[PDB]
Amino acid sequence: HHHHMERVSITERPDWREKAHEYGFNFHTMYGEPYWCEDAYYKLTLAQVEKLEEVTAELHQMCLKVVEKVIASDELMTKFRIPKHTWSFVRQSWLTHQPSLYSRLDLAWDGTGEPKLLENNADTPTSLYEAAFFQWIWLEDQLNAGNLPEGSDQFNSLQEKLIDRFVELREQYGFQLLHLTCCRDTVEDRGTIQYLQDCATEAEIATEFLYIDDIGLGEKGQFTDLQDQVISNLFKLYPWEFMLREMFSTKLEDAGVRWLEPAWKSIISNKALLPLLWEMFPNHPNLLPAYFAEDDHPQMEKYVVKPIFSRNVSIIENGKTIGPYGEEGMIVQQFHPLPKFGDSYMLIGSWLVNDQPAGIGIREDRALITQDMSRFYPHIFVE
Ligand SMILES: [Mg+2]
Ligand code: NI
């Protein structure tokens, strides 16, 4: 398999599991978070990193164009499956310019051709802790042990940009006190929450963690915390796709809470994004053909049908029409295999902090069709 990036074997640091334990990083797979691996790393070039950076910034602007178009159209809000009882909540979040913290794009690329957008995890993207912090320490450690090329660098400014963004949220948007939440018995001990809380603390934001089921309902519709005090700003590791359909989700519109990620990110964190991107930016070098499966659309020789929702996938070929999952609620996307390095397919996770590209985290998986890649590998770039 010819690639312009290499997967380089390396001797694992002997104590990395305890390094994880000391930081409170549970590196085991859970809720789509990948298993940490470091018996190899990926090596990119400076040219490849500048290309990924360029493409990531532009795709994010393209996604912002999709939101404006969807927000304005009842028809498109329906096609994106935003529940009608939440349209006012979601639209007001966009029309008042509610701020974003982060996004992760998933890009298929081995350095040959153009990178292709497979999805924008713009709500609850996994592998933040590994990409921002753990692989940074890995780089410093393995440089010090003499196990990496002398000029090794890493496309990764996540921690710096996250702290700067929290400062910006505090100073210019009034995020003085930030609550953080997730569902009980999910990812509270993975590392992410504590890490983002540490970043917010460094930015001089006061923080409180509480589980989703800890949140109270006040007499005037306000959401309240473990001290029965009002929640004003709430970061969540729990997706809008679920919350907008949950019991008492009609209360969101009047709760007086500002959200990270904000409600309008629901529109770019599902697969309906991919057909709209292709319609608004036809033959864009970094997009793949995509259509709603229910629409009349060109026939593709080999393609993949994915549910609009993030809750598995099937492949079709030889110009056939649509399958166990059917047509309804599905999109279709031109089949485009991931690069194969040995026994595993590789996927590039490319991060944004608000609208600024902030680096990459690489994942692998032995299956072609997978919602969340099973394994994470650190990377470097040279030259
Ligand atoms: Mg109102
Ligand atoms: Ni320990």
Coordinates of C-alpha atoms and ligand atoms in Angstrom, one line a residue:
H1 CA 0.0 0.0 0.0
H2 CA 1.5 3.3 -1.2
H3 CA 1.1 6.2 1.2
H4 CA 2.8 9.6 1.7
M5 CA 2.6 9.2 5.5
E6 CA 4.2 6.4 7.4
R7 CA 3.2 4.4 10.4
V8 CA 6.5 3.9 12.3
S9 CA 6.9 1.1 14.9
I10 CA 8.2 2.4 18.3
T11 CA 9.0 0.8 21.7
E12 CA 6.2 1.8 24.1
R13 CA 7.2 4.0 27.0
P14 CA 7.5 1.6 29.9
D15 CA 5.2 3.5 32.3
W16 CA 2.5 5.1 30.1
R17 CA -0.4 3.3 31.8
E18 CA 0.7 4.7 35.2
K19 CA 1.2 8.1 33.5
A20 CA -2.4 7.9 32.5
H21 CA -3.5 6.8 36.0
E22 CA -1.7 9.7 37.5
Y23 CA -3.6 12.2 35.3
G24 CA -6.9 10.4 35.7
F25 CA -7.0 9.3 32.1
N26 CA -8.9 6.1 31.6
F27 CA -7.5 5.0 28.3
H28 CA -9.9 2.0 27.9
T29 CA -12.6 2.1 25.1
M30 CA -15.9 3.5 26.2
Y31 CA -18.8 5.5 24.5
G32 CA -16.9 5.8 21.3
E33 CA -13.7 7.0 23.0
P34 CA -10.7 5.0 21.6
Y35 CA -8.1 2.8 23.2
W36 CA -4.7 4.5 23.5
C37 CA -1.9 2.8 21.6
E38 CA 1.8 3.8 21.3
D39 CA 3.7 0.8 19.9
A40 CA 3.6 2.9 16.7
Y41 CA 3.1 6.5 15.6
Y42 CA 2.2 8.3 12.4
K43 CA 4.8 10.5 10.7
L44 CA 3.5 13.4 8.5
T45 CA 5.3 16.2 6.7
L46 CA 5.1 19.9 7.3
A47 CA 3.4 20.3 3.9
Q48 CA 0.7 17.7 4.8
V49 CA 0.0 19.5 8.1
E50 CA -0.3 22.9 6.4
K51 CA -2.7 21.3 3.9
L52 CA -4.9 19.7 6.7
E53 CA -4.9 23.1 8.5
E54 CA -6.1 24.9 5.4
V55 CA -8.7 22.4 4.5
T56 CA -10.0 22.2 8.1
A57 CA -10.4 26.0 8.3
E58 CA -12.3 26.1 5.0
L59 CA -14.6 23.2 5.7
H60 CA -15.6 24.8 9.0
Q61 CA -16.6 28.0 7.2
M62 CA -18.6 25.8 4.7
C63 CA -20.4 24.2 7.7
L64 CA -21.3 27.6 9.0
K65 CA -22.8 28.3 5.6
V66 CA -24.9 25.1 5.8
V67 CA -26.2 26.3 9.2
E68 CA -27.4 29.6 7.9
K69 CA -29.2 27.9 5.0
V70 CA -30.9 25.3 7.3
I71 CA -31.9 27.7 10.0
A72 CA -33.8 29.8 7.4
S73 CA -35.8 26.8 6.0
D74 CA -38.5 24.8 7.8
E75 CA -38.1 22.2 5.0
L76 CA -34.4 21.8 5.7
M77 CA -34.9 21.8 9.5
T78 CA -37.3 18.9 8.9
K79 CA -34.8 17.1 6.6
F80 CA -32.1 17.5 9.2
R81 CA -34.5 15.9 11.7
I82 CA -34.4 18.7 14.2
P83 CA -37.5 18.1 16.3
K84 CA -40.1 20.8 15.5
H85 CA -40.8 21.5 19.2
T86 CA -37.1 22.7 19.5
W87 CA -36.9 24.8 16.4
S88 CA -37.3 28.0 18.3
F89 CA -34.6 27.0 20.8
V90 CA -32.2 26.0 18.0
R91 CA -32.9 29.0 15.8
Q92 CA -32.6 31.6 18.6
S93 CA -29.2 30.0 19.4
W94 CA -28.0 30.8 15.9
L95 CA -29.7 34.2 15.6
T96 CA -28.1 35.4 18.9
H97 CA -24.6 34.1 17.7
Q98 CA -24.1 31.7 20.6
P99 CA -20.4 30.8 20.8
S100 CA -18.8 27.5 20.0
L101 CA -15.9 25.8 21.9
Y102 CA -14.8 22.9 19.7
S103 CA -15.5 20.6 16.7
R104 CA -13.7 17.6 15.2
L105 CA -13.7 16.8 11.5
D106 CA -13.1 13.3 10.3
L107 CA -10.9 13.4 7.1
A108 CA -9.9 10.4 4.9
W109 CA -6.3 11.0 3.7
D110 CA -3.0 9.3 3.3
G111 CA -1.2 12.3 1.8
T112 CA -2.1 11.3 -1.7
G113 CA -4.9 13.1 -3.5
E114 CA -7.2 15.5 -1.6
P115 CA -8.4 14.8 2.0
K116 CA -12.2 14.0 2.1
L117 CA -14.7 15.0 4.8
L118 CA -16.5 12.0 6.2
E119 CA -18.3 13.8 9.1
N120 CA -18.2 16.8 11.5
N121 CA -18.4 15.7 15.1
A122 CA -19.5 19.1 16.2
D123 CA -21.3 18.4 19.4
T124 CA -19.6 15.7 21.6
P125 CA -16.4 14.8 19.7
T126 CA -14.4 11.9 21.2
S127 CA -10.6 11.6 21.7
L128 CA -10.0 15.2 23.0
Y129 CA -7.8 14.3 26.0
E130 CA -5.5 12.1 23.9
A131 CA -5.2 14.6 21.1
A132 CA -4.7 17.7 23.3
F133 CA -2.6 16.5 26.1
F134 CA -1.6 12.8 26.3
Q135 CA 0.0 12.7 22.8
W136 CA 1.9 16.0 23.7
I137 CA 3.5 14.4 26.7
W138 CA 4.2 11.3 24.6
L139 CA 6.1 13.5 22.1
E140 CA 8.2 15.2 24.9
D141 CA 8.9 11.8 26.5
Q142 CA 10.0 10.0 23.4
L143 CA 12.1 13.0 22.2
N144 CA 13.9 12.9 25.6
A145 CA 14.4 9.2 25.3
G146 CA 16.0 9.7 21.9
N147 CA 13.4 7.6 20.1
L148 CA 12.1 10.2 17.6
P149 CA 13.8 12.2 14.8
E150 CA 15.7 15.2 16.2
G151 CA 13.4 17.9 14.7
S152 CA 10.1 16.1 15.6
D153 CA 7.0 18.4 16.0
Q154 CA 3.3 17.8 16.3
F155 CA 0.3 19.5 14.7
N156 CA -1.4 20.2 18.0
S157 CA -2.3 23.6 19.6
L158 CA -5.4 22.3 21.4
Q159 CA -4.5 23.1 24.9
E160 CA -3.3 26.6 24.1
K161 CA -6.3 27.4 22.0
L162 CA -8.8 25.9 24.4
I163 CA -7.4 28.0 27.3
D164 CA -7.4 31.2 25.0
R165 CA -11.0 30.4 24.0
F166 CA -12.2 30.1 27.6
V167 CA -10.5 33.4 28.4
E168 CA -12.3 34.9 25.4
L169 CA -15.6 33.3 26.6
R170 CA -15.1 34.8 30.1
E171 CA -13.9 38.2 29.2
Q172 CA -16.0 38.9 26.1
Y173 CA -19.1 36.7 26.6
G174 CA -19.4 36.8 30.3
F175 CA -18.8 33.1 31.1
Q176 CA -17.7 33.8 34.7
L177 CA -19.1 30.5 36.1
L178 CA -19.2 27.3 33.9
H179 CA -21.0 24.2 34.9
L180 CA -19.9 20.9 33.3
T181 CA -22.1 17.8 33.0
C182 CA -22.4 14.4 31.5
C183 CA -24.7 11.4 31.9
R184 CA -24.0 9.4 35.1
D185 CA -22.0 6.2 34.5
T186 CA -20.6 7.3 31.1
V187 CA -17.4 9.3 30.6
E188 CA -17.1 11.3 33.9
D189 CA -13.8 9.6 34.7
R190 CA -12.4 9.3 31.2
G191 CA -10.3 12.5 31.6
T192 CA -12.1 14.9 29.3
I193 CA -14.2 16.6 31.9
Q194 CA -11.4 17.2 34.4
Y195 CA -9.2 18.3 31.6
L196 CA -11.6 20.9 30.3
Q197 CA -12.3 22.0 33.8
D198 CA -8.5 22.4 34.3
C199 CA -8.4 24.5 31.1
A200 CA -11.3 26.6 32.3
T201 CA -9.7 27.1 35.7
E202 CA -6.4 28.3 34.1
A203 CA -8.6 30.8 32.2
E204 CA -9.9 32.0 35.6
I205 CA -13.4 30.6 35.0
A206 CA -15.1 29.2 38.1
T207 CA -16.4 25.7 37.4
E208 CA -18.8 23.1 38.9
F209 CA -19.3 19.5 37.8
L210 CA -22.7 17.7 38.2
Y211 CA -24.4 14.8 36.5
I212 CA -27.3 15.4 34.1
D213 CA -29.7 13.8 36.6
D214 CA -28.4 16.2 39.3
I215 CA -29.8 19.3 37.5
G216 CA -32.8 20.7 39.1
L217 CA -35.9 22.6 37.8
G218 CA -36.6 25.9 39.5
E219 CA -40.0 27.5 39.9
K220 CA -39.5 29.9 36.9
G221 CA -38.0 27.3 34.5
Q222 CA -34.4 27.8 35.5
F223 CA -31.9 24.9 35.8
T224 CA -30.2 24.6 39.2
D225 CA -27.1 22.9 40.4
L226 CA -26.1 20.8 43.5
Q227 CA -26.4 23.9 45.7
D228 CA -29.8 24.8 44.2
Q229 CA -28.2 27.8 42.6
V230 CA -28.9 28.9 39.0
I231 CA -26.9 27.4 36.1
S232 CA -26.1 30.1 33.5
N233 CA -23.5 28.4 31.3
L234 CA -23.4 24.6 30.8
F235 CA -20.8 22.5 29.0
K236 CA -22.0 19.0 28.2
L237 CA -20.6 15.7 27.0
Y238 CA -24.0 14.6 25.9
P239 CA -25.4 15.1 22.4
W240 CA -28.2 17.4 21.2
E241 CA -29.4 14.5 19.0
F242 CA -30.5 12.8 22.3
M243 CA -31.4 15.9 24.4
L244 CA -33.8 17.5 21.8
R245 CA -36.0 14.3 22.0
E246 CA -35.9 13.8 25.8
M247 CA -38.6 14.2 28.3
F248 CA -39.2 17.9 29.1
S249 CA -36.9 19.0 26.3
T250 CA -39.6 21.7 25.6
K251 CA -38.2 23.4 28.7
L252 CA -34.8 24.1 27.0
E253 CA -36.0 27.2 25.2
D254 CA -36.9 29.0 28.4
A255 CA -34.2 27.6 30.7
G256 CA -31.9 30.7 30.5
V257 CA -28.9 28.5 29.9
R258 CA -26.1 29.1 27.4
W259 CA -24.7 25.8 26.2
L260 CA -21.4 24.4 25.0
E261 CA -21.7 23.2 22.4
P262 CA -24.5 25.6 21.5
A263 CA -27.9 24.4 20.3
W264 CA -27.2 25.3 16.6
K265 CA -24.4 22.8 16.5
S266 CA -27.2 20.2 16.3
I267 CA -27.4 21.1 12.6
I268 CA -23.9 20.3 11.7
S269 CA -23.4 17.2 14.0
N270 CA -25.5 14.7 11.9
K271 CA -25.1 13.1 8.5
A272 CA -27.6 15.4 6.8
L273 CA -24.6 17.9 6.7
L274 CA -23.0 15.8 3.9
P275 CA -25.7 16.1 1.2
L276 CA -26.1 19.8 1.9
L277 CA -22.4 20.5 1.7
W278 CA -22.3 18.7 -1.6
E279 CA -25.3 20.7 -2.9
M280 CA -23.9 24.0 -1.8
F281 CA -20.3 23.2 -2.9
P282 CA -20.6 20.8 -5.8
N283 CA -17.3 19.1 -6.8
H284 CA -15.5 20.7 -3.9
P285 CA -12.0 19.0 -3.8
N286 CA -12.5 18.0 -0.1
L287 CA -16.1 16.7 -0.3
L288 CA -17.6 13.4 -1.5
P289 CA -20.9 13.1 -3.4
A290 CA -23.8 12.8 -0.9
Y291 CA -27.6 12.8 -1.2
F292 CA -30.6 12.2 0.9
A293 CA -31.6 8.6 0.2
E294 CA -35.2 9.6 -0.2
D295 CA -34.5 12.2 -2.9
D296 CA -34.1 11.6 -6.6
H297 CA -30.3 11.6 -7.0
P298 CA -27.6 10.4 -9.4
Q299 CA -26.8 6.7 -9.4
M300 CA -23.4 5.9 -7.8
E301 CA -21.4 2.9 -8.8
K302 CA -20.3 2.1 -5.2
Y303 CA -21.7 4.0 -2.2
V304 CA -22.6 3.8 1.4
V305 CA -26.0 4.3 3.1
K306 CA -25.7 5.9 6.6
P307 CA -28.5 7.0 8.9
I308 CA -28.9 10.7 9.3
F309 CA -28.7 10.0 13.0
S310 CA -25.5 8.9 14.8
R311 CA -27.3 5.7 16.1
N312 CA -24.7 1.0 11.6
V313 CA -23.9 1.4 7.9
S314 CA -24.1 -0.7 4.8
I315 CA -22.3 -0.6 1.4
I316 CA -23.7 -1.1 -2.1
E317 CA -22.0 -1.5 -5.5
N318 CA -22.3 -2.1 -9.3
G319 CA -24.8 0.7 -9.8
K320 CA -27.6 -1.0 -7.8
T321 CA -30.4 0.9 -6.2
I322 CA -31.2 0.6 -2.4
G323 CA -30.6 -3.1 2.0
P324 CA -31.5 -4.1 5.6
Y325 CA -31.9 -0.5 6.8
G326 CA -34.1 0.8 4.0
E327 CA -34.3 4.3 2.6
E328 CA -36.1 6.5 5.1
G329 CA -33.9 8.7 7.3
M330 CA -30.8 7.8 5.4
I331 CA -28.2 9.6 3.4
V332 CA -26.1 8.0 0.6
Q333 CA -22.4 8.9 0.1
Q334 CA -19.9 7.9 -2.5
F335 CA -17.9 5.0 -1.2
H336 CA -14.3 6.1 -0.5
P337 CA -12.1 3.6 1.4
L338 CA -9.9 4.7 4.2
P339 CA -6.1 4.2 3.7
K340 CA -5.0 0.9 4.9
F341 CA -1.8 0.6 7.0
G342 CA -1.1 -3.0 7.6
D343 CA -4.2 -4.7 9.0
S344 CA -6.0 -1.4 9.9
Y345 CA -7.8 1.5 8.3
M346 CA -6.6 5.0 9.4
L347 CA -8.7 8.1 10.0
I348 CA -7.5 11.7 10.7
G349 CA -9.4 13.6 13.3
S350 CA -8.9 17.3 12.7
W351 CA -9.8 19.7 15.5
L352 CA -11.2 23.2 15.6
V353 CA -11.4 25.5 18.6
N354 CA -14.2 27.7 17.5
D355 CA -13.2 28.4 13.9
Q356 CA -9.4 27.9 14.3
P357 CA -7.7 24.6 13.3
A358 CA -6.0 23.2 16.4
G359 CA -4.3 19.9 15.3
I360 CA -4.9 16.2 14.5
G361 CA -5.4 13.0 16.3
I362 CA -5.1 9.8 14.4
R363 CA -7.3 6.7 14.8
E364 CA -7.2 3.1 13.5
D365 CA -9.7 0.3 13.2
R366 CA -9.7 -3.2 11.6
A367 CA -13.2 -2.8 10.2
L368 CA -14.1 -0.6 7.3
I369 CA -17.6 0.3 8.5
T370 CA -17.2 1.8 12.0
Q371 CA -19.0 4.6 13.8
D372 CA -16.0 5.3 16.2
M373 CA -12.5 4.0 15.4
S374 CA -11.3 1.6 18.1
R375 CA -7.7 2.8 18.6
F376 CA -5.8 6.1 18.8
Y377 CA -2.1 6.7 17.8
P378 CA 0.1 9.7 18.4
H379 CA 1.8 11.4 15.5
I380 CA 4.7 13.7 14.6
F381 CA 5.5 15.8 11.6
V382 CA 9.0 16.5 10.3
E383 CA 10.6 19.0 7.7
Ligands
MG1 MG -38.8 33.2 24.6
NI2 NI -1.2 5.8 39.8

